[PDB]
């Protein structure tokens, strides 16, 4: 009963997992993911760890270097090693579930291997917790929470000061890339609250 995992798919194929502990729940999820989206997931893994060129060739080298340059894998592994048993069971159950299906695929590839593996000339390998973590880091954290253009901003500011003088140049920077603009429509209405901090808007870190 502790061992049992029930998988039910609805009329659009959406899977519902029924399990009695954390590892088994996430194993069921990993398993259905490996059934539905193996090639997508394999390619997502390679994208998030910069191992695309290994399968796709020279046109992806720069891409792979750029991915590897933007993270520190041992740090991610250190966070995983710090997890409690219950948290670790999420990532491990999920990897273990994908692996159970991957193993079935590599045992009977003549009917179970996604066609894209044949097309692109390689076969899927097993997953670990780090790989599951890295899907999220590489497609969430890096896609949507890692945005800065400060070096370009400083180049713009330098060019503006060269064109208009130091003072007008800084004021034109503040017109094109304002720190804040009080007429911005805000999800939280001003009657509810306002953000209490005020920021320097004249590059005073190098003043």
């Amino acid at each position: 009963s502790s061992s049992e995992i029930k998988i039910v798919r609805d009329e659009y194929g959406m899977p519902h997992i029924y399990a009695n502990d954390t590892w088994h729940l996430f194993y069921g999820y990993g398993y259905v993911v490996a059934q539905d989206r193996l090639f997508q997931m394999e390619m997502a893994r390679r994208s998030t760890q910069g191992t695309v060129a290994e399968v796709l060739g020279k046109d992806f080298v720069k891409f792979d270097k750029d991915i590897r340059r933007n993270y520190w894998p041992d740090a991610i592994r250190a966070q995983i090693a710090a997890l409690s048993p219950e948290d670790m069971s999420i990532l491990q159950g999920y990897a273990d579930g994908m692996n159970a299906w991957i193993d079935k695929v590599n045992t009977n590839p003549e009917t179970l291997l996604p066609k894209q593996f044949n097309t692109f000339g390689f076969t899927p390998k097993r997953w670990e917790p780090f790989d599951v973590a890295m899907i999220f880091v590489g497609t969430m954290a890096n896609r949507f929470s890692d945005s800065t253009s400060e070096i370009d901003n400083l180049a713009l500011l330098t060019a503006l000061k060269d064109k208009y003088g130091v003072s007008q140049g800084m004021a034109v920077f503040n017109q094109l890339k304002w720190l804040v603009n009080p007429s911005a429509p805000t999800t939280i209405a001003v009657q509810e609250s306002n953000y209490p901090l005020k920021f320097n808007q004249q590059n005073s870190q190098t003043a």
Partner: protein, 557 residues
């Protein structure tokens, strides 16, 4: 990505309605993955990007959740001081400190492998170095060290049964992400989640800081400072990657601004139109905002003012009359290729001309090209993501508002000329350009509609499917890659929650070795295009009543 959460005081025939449209671009197989989890403290249904353990979009029968990217400034660059006498070191708090470094080898199919080094300081990975100035730039993230915790926060939040339990997990999510809540009692809420640095006084977050120690962040700001609201007096929560709150600063990206011109106002206009919204009305906001030209509202007044004393036969005036008669909703003609009205093309040529004559001319090259885009720039595959008001247009909007704008116009973008003269000149350019392509009878102009493509290459530009698996839709729609809606305490059902979503092209990406596509490979494509939706089941009885197949596994860890 958009979201509108309608609370008790604004909902019709329900206590709360949540409608989310996360915009991630369009891919085949689907960007998100549908999944229900039941047991070990979970009882949830929804869909989530790349099948993360945590569902970003879903509900648990008591509360519902969703997200939009936050775009707060949680990243700063530190300029590290290097020394040619001491390669691999940097000055920090008065000492020369060794950088961390690691070697990586890129293995290459049908090629030679390549090895390179990645370097890292106390402030983050090094992006680039200038040997000329002996400076190396390190990228500091407020969420550094909390990546895994953020993933777990998005998973544990799925078990929350009220605002306090949910906000306890929201406080653990460290990336810059807007999170939204709704519940069976009609409560609604929002938190601009994430870790944000507590910067030293004098630190302008838009520009690099010295890495030598004095400019180091003091630590991270407390959760109490994250923008949040629970049961706002407006009765709703609307977001389209706009500012969370008065005086809250945006990402430092030069192309990203929170100003008077914001696409979220199109949602507010629809929400405020009627006193209360039913679930069908709230869903219909997707179709309307999907088709809404975003620049008409911003610039129509300026165009109308500029052409107000012109004679009826002046073509500058006839272009603006055409816009005045239009609500800005694009619709396809029957050919499935062209838009019924030409207003987006009129605004695009006019705005391009305007920006070239104003913001572009004020900014030194090559930075001027950051301000020249109109917002209509595509691919023949159609836009890769959402459409927005361009940076240049947001800056032009402030200039055309005159002293209604709170931003000092340190440089007059009109360069001493009357705004009307430049607006009219741009209109003259527009008539010349469009009349040469389409002739002089505006009423028969059949301008090209944008299309939508479910790309076989993922957002990184890496194949996630064969090129023939790319899927095409005639109507570009400025909407979520997926859309999901959750309705709490409907008066039309005894069920505490009803919920729907759409995950196109389908749940499965499986193609067998002989080319046979799965039965769920493309069964949600038509539903997506027509603004349809499928029921998300949660309960055992609902799941059982809609069961197609089942498997039972017996597994020992």
């Amino acid at each position: 990505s958009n979201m509108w959460v309608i609370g008790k005081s604004k909902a019709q025939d329900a206590k709360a309605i949540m409608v989310n449209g996360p915009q991630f671009g369009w891919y085949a197989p689907a960007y998100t993955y549908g999944i229900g989890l039941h047991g070990a403290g979970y009882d949830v249904t929804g869909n989530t990007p790349f099948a993360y353990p945590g569902l970003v979009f879903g509900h648990n029968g008591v509360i519902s959740w969703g997200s939009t990217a936050g775009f707060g400034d949680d990243v700063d660059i530190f300029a590290e001081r290097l020394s040619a006498e001491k390669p691999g070191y940097y000055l920090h708090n008065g000492k020369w400190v060794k950088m961390l470094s690691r070697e990586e080898t890129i293995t290459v199919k049908n090629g030679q492998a390549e090895t390179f080094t990645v370097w890292r300081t106390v402030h983050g990975n090094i992006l680039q170095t200038d040997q000329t100035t002996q400076t190396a730039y390190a990228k500091s993230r407020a969420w550094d060290g909390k990546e895994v915790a953020s993933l777990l926060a998005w998973t544990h939040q799925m078990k929350a049964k009220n605002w306090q339990e949910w906000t306890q997990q929201a406080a653990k999510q460290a990336l810059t992400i807007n999170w939204y809540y709704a519940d069976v009692n009609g409560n609604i809420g929002y938190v601009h989640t994430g870790a944000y640095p507590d910067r030293q006084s004098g630190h302008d977050p838009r520009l690099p800081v010295p890495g030598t120690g004095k400019w180091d962040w003091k630590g991270l700001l407390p959760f109490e400072m994250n923008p949040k609201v629970y049961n706002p007096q407006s009765g709703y929560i609307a977001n389209w990657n706009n500012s969370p709150q008065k005086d809250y600063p945006a990402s430092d990206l030069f192309a990203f601004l929170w100003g008077g011109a914001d696409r979220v106002t199109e949602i507010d206009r629809l929400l405020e139109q009627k006193p209360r919204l039913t679930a069908d009305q709230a869903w219909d906001v997707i179709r309307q905002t999907s088709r809404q030209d975003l620049n008409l509202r911003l610039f129509l007044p300026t165009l109308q003012a500029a052409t107000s004393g012109l004679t009826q036969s002046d073509p500058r005036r006839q272009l603006v009359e055409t816009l005045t008669r239009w609500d800005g909703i694009n619709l396809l003609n029957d050919d499935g290729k062209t838009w019924q009205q030409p207003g987006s093309a009129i605004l695009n040529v006019w705005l391009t001309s305007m920006l070239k004559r104003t913001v572009v001319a004020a900014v030194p090259m090559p930075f001027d090209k950051w301000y020249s885009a109109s917002g209509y720039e595509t691919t023949q595959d159609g836009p890769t993501g959402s459409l927005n008001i361009s940076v240049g247009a947001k800056i032009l909007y402030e200039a055309v508002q005159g002293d209604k704008s709170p931003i000092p116009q340190a440089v007059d973008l009109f360069a001493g000329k009357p705004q009307q003269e430049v607006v009219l000149a741009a209109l003259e350019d527009t008539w010349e350009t469009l009349s040469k392509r389409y002739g002089n009878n505006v009423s028969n102009w059949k301008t090209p509609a944008m299309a939508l493509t479910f790309r076989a290459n993922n957002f990184f530009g890496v194949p996630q499917a064969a090129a023939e698996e790319t899927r095409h839709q005639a109507e570009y729609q400025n909407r979520g890659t997926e859309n999901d809606m959750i309705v709490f305490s409907p008066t039309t059902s005894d069920r505490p929650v009803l919920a729907w979503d759409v995950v196109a092209p389908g749940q499965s990406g499986f193609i067998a070795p002989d080319g046979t596509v799965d039965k769920h490979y493309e069964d949600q494509l038509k539903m997506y295009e027509n603004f349809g939706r499928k029921s998300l089941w949660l309960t055992k009885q609902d799941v059982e009543a809609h069961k197609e197949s089942q498997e039972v596994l017996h597994v020992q860890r």
